[PDB]
Write a protein that binds this ligand. Structure first.
Ligand code: ZN
Length: 1000
């Protein structure tokens, strides 16, 4: 029995879209607390019976890459911090410390002698060193896919459980640049009870501070019942540093950062050593700060973080921080007139205390739905820039996301011999991808050399996945009686037509066929999705005279197109030595399908040939053996249709102007246009973080560009060489695919945007997704500057009136908006000469060619059951969801390396159940190595919610044979929540559930 997530609108105290509408966002000088007010408390609030309980929580913010690489930071800082944490906590039993980034902690702990490891275990066992979140990293929450958020969590917690027998239930996220409700969603399904956040808009901090709504029960925007709710603490002030964590006046709080006496206080009053001669006056000053902070919160329990970036490095910082705070605590606790108990504490300690206060009925907490984007730290400094910064690696994230899913799924079907090194490869791949989830990784907010490290690590991870996938496929499709593997040998190379993209790197392999050299070639397609899929696939072939069969030698209809490249005035050139064979692979759920490419004399029976039309003035171009000559013509408008699918009209610069859905229905206008944003000459400069445009975007001079039109029975495309962008519309008989080869070059202080202009009556309403999990209603707010109407576009955005919807699906996270009724726009790249003064200490001048990929879905929704007009969520159609699925998890292509393949079977997984379209097996992962008694395999099942507009049961517990046991688990697989006999019940719309099947 499942919630309805469409018709029922949840009741919450704070709904962030609603709050945003009714908020003035006035940037008033508030006093010592610049972005709030002068806090008052009644001092008779406190007495011997109602005391203020103060937890002072030492911490050290450790970036796994930012100004330095992971390994640079490890050697310069983090190993010294964790060594000293070990020593000082051992010697000082009341001293406490929290640690978030398990990537750094695993690096450290594995390097320890056995004595140190057991000393480390003792300070974690007695709760002195407490792990918070326990993720590999503290992830980005804007650009990150929920799958990779769960991956990095799963990897840090699995490491903590294996090596420290602990699983944190309190999250600490002090640095991500705005906050997603995806985090509570995953954490609450991973056994968490509490989470803390910091970087929310100063006007939101003020508004919530005023109603003491900084602690709230954060539920998903669709959850009527509140089962998703997680207790959230929002910190009230500008920073997580010591000046902004003691209370409202940083000039006072900075005096209680005892490390600042080659560091100083900006407010020019230094810390002073605490003595019997000044402790009374210092404690008065400090407790006054504490009691002002407590006014903003509903319990008599107060959280005081004590730290900053890479703090607790030197042994004397540990002494000076600990000893001075001891003296203060000694004085304050001994002196009844304060009515304070103050002590070193952990985050869990804080939350426990707050819950005890809730139980005792001391406080009742408000409910909240929504997100905390776009973040502004002051004035108009909105952090929408990093939604696009380093878009190459943003793209690379999504490709590696898929290769890790595919590698884990393919290698999961079987136990492997350790000589195969499957587990080594998958651990490397998970960890490089996990590291990139860091809030200076996927964000593009790291120094040039660190981005290079991230790229080289993800490159290595891609090669590890390829090796696992090709080994796996060879095993799945070779006769058992023949299968005799060389675990070091390349049986298949992978073909990927979308990463990096030919035009970024000309690196795809050409299958070389000859009547004598080599007449045929086995190819295999993998389908990670759990339903039958039929998708056009392509390969490079050395002859255009190629025919496709399955292994059973049934002909398959195919099309051959030329291989086109673009060069510098920007014009295409065709190959005379390679061709694209295009055909429809039918692949089973979570399955494999084999096909054969065979050469012939001449045009084979079942292979068509695309025409080519080169629209320019002053035309010519050979194509070797390509049997249809390249035609020429002057720039002009062009219509194209593939299959019964839509009919697209293109300008004479090869940009979409119109879509006709069906043969009766109208030519709906849909104009693609490239524009620029610039940087402010005066005042605040755009950087890796901040988007600060000098006014609305201004159109790009296109000139007369060369337009290439390729027309074929299975696939046609319109390509054009614009300055900065080779734009391409590909048609295969449904929603078209948009490809931009973006080369911003050295156009300093430029942001290239792509805008869609329709007559859709959207108004001020658009929808953007969070972490590729949910779509959230946005409202353009004219009261906020442009950069504040920019939101993350991690996997899609859409506009709609009562009749029409346009959805743009992305293969990469980029920033975007709807800045006017019937518009969508999405930034492609940004080049920025200036730093934006958030500590990166450079601009963005390392741009490189990236191939961005999209699907464009124009649909009628007048017949779709749309949620209440008051609902803060949107839901994709089946067609838009399947289009996102085609971008993020396409079919994998495998070319057999060797001349002959004995044992070859033509299919795997034909028996596998084809689950409802809204269901996905997000994760298949074998949880046990071979040496193990009982093999265990984890499945994450996510079910989305599709808009209804008028399939076999999938039980993952049975996918593998000899199932002995089957548990519903936390999403990390670390805790059993339910023994099941051993059927997994399917999951509600917008729900995610994990299961582990055991095998005898
Ligand atoms: Zn950070």
């Amino acid at each position: 029995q499942c919630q309805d997530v469409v018709q029922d609108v949840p009741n919450v105290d704070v709904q962030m879209l609603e709050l945003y509408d009714r908020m003035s966002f006035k940037d008033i000088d508030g006093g010592v607390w610049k972005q709030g007010w002068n806090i008052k408390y009644d001092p008779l609030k406190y007495n011997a019976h109602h005391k203020l309980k103060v937890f002072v929580v030492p911490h050290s913010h450790n970036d796994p890459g930012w100004i330095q690489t992971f390994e640079e930071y490890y050697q310069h800082d983090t190993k010294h911090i964790l060594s000293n944490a070990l020593r000082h906590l051992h010697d000082n039993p009341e001293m406490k410390f929290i640690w978030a980034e398990i990537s750094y902690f695993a690096r450290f702990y594995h390097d320890l002698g056995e004595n140190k490891k057991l000393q480390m275990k003792s300070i974690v066992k007695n709760g002195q060193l407490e792990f918070v979140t326990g993720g590999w990293v503290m992830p980005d929450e804007a650009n990150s896919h929920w799958r990779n958020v769960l991956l990095q969590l799963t990897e840090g917690q699995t490491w903590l459980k294996q090596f420290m027998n602990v699983t944190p239930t309190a999250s600490w996220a002090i640095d991500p640049f705005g906050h997603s409700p995806t985090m509570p969603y995953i954490l609450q399904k991973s056994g968490f009870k509490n989470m803390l956040i910091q970087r929310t808009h100063y006007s939101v901090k003020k508004e919530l501070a005023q109603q003491r709504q900084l602690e709230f029960l954060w539920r998903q925007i669709w959850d009527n019942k509140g089962d998703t709710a997680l207790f959230t603490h929002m910190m009230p002030f500008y920073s997580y540093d010591i000046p902004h964590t003691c209370g409202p006046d940083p000039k006072v709080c900075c005096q209680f950062d005892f490390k600042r006496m080659g560091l100083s206080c900006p407010w020019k009053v230094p810390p002073r050593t605490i003595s019997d001669q000044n402790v009374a006056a210092r404690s008065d000053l400090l407790v006054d700060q504490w009691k002002k902070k407590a006014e903003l919160y509903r319990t008599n329990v107060l959280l005081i973080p004590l730290g900053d970036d890479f703090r607790f490095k030197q042994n004397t910082e540990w002494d000076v921080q600990r000893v001075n705070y001891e003296r203060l605590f000694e004085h304050i606790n001994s002196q009844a007139h304060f009515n304070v108990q103050a002590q070193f504490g952990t985050l869990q300690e804080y939350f426990d205390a707050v819950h005890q206060a809730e139980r005792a009925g001391q406080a009742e907490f408000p409910t909240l739905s929504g997100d905390f984007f776009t973040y502004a730290d002051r004035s108009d400094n909105y952090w929408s820039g990093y939604y696009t910064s380093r878009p190459y690696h943003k793209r690379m994230d999504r490709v590696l996301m898929h290769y890790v899913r595919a590698a884990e799924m393919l290698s999961a079907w079987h136990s492997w011999d350790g000589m195969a090194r499957i587990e080594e490869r998958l651990e490397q791949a998970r960890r490089e991808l996990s590291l990139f989830q860091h809030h200076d990784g996927i964000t593009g907010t790291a120094k040039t050399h660190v981005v290079v490290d991230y790229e080289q690590r993800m490159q290595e991870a891609l090669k590890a996945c390829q090796m696992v996938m090709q080994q796996s496929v060879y095993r799945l499709l070779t006769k058992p009686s023949i299968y005799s593997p060389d675990f070091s040998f390349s049986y298949f190379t992978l073909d990927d037509s979308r990463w990096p993209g030919s035009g970024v790197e000309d690196s795809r392999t050409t299958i070389i066929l000859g009547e004598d050299i080599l007449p045929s070639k086995h190819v295999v397609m993998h389908n990670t999705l759990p339903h039958w899929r039929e998708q056009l696939v392509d390969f490079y072939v050395s002859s255009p005279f190629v025919s496709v069969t399955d292994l059973a030698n049934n002909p398959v209809e195919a099309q051959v197109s030329p291989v086109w490249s673009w060069h510098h005035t920007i014009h295409p050139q065709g190959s005379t030595t390679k061709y694209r064979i295009i055909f429809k692979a039918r692949v089973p759920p979570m399955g494999l399908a084999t096909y054969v490419l065979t050469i012939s004399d001449s045009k084979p029976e079942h292979t068509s040939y695309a025409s080519n039309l080169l629209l320019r003035k002053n035309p010519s171009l050979p194509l070797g053996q390509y049997p249809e000559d390249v035609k020429f013509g002057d720039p002009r408008e062009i219509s194209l249709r593939v299959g019964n699918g839509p009919t697209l009209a293109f300008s004479e610069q090869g940009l979409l102007k119109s879509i006709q859905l069906t043969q009766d229905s109208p030519h709906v206008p849909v104009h693609f246009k490239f524009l620029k944003y610039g940087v402010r000459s005066h005042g605040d400069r755009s950087g890796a973080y901040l988007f600060l445009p000098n006014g609305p975007a201004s159109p790009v001079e296109l000139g007369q560009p060369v337009v290439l039109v390729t027309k074929g029975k299975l696939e046609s495309s319109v390509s054009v060489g614009l300055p900065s962008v080779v734009h391409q519309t590909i048609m295969r008989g449904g929603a078209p695919e948009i490809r931009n080869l973006v080369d911003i070059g050295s156009l300093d202080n430029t942001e290239i945007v792509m805008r869609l202009e329709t007559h859709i009556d959207s108004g001020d309403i658009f929808y953007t997704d969070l972490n590729g999990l949910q779509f959230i209603k946005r409202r353009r707010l004219d009261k906020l500057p442009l950069q504040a109407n920019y939101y993350p576009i991690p996997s899609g955005m859409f506009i709609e009136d009562a009749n029409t919807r346009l959805t743009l699906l992305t293969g990469q996270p980029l920033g975007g908006s709807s800045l006017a009724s019937g518009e969508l726009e999405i930034m492609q790249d940004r080049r920025l000469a200036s730093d934006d003064e958030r500590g990166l200490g450079q601009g963005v001048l390392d741009n490189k060619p990236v191939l961005h990929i999209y699907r464009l879905v124009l649909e009628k929704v007048n017949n779709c059951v749309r949620p209440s007009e008051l609902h803060p969520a949107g839901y994709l159609t089946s067609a838009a969801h399947k289009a996102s699925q085609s971008l993020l998890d396409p079919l994998d292509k495998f070319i057999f390396a060797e001349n002959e393949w004995i044992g070859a079977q033509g299919q795997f997984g034909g028996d596998h159940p084809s689950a409802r379209e809204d269901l996905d097996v997000s994760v298949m992962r074998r949880l046990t190595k071979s040496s193990a008694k009982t093999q265990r395999v984890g499945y994450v099942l996510h079910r989305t919610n599709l808009m209804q507009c008028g399939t076999q049961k999938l039980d993952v517990c049975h996918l593998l044979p000899n199932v002995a046991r089957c548990e519903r688990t936390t999403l990390t697989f670390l805790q059993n929540l339910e023994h099941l006999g051993m059927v997994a019940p399917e999951v509600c719309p917008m729900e995610t559930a994990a299961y582990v099947s055991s095998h005898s």
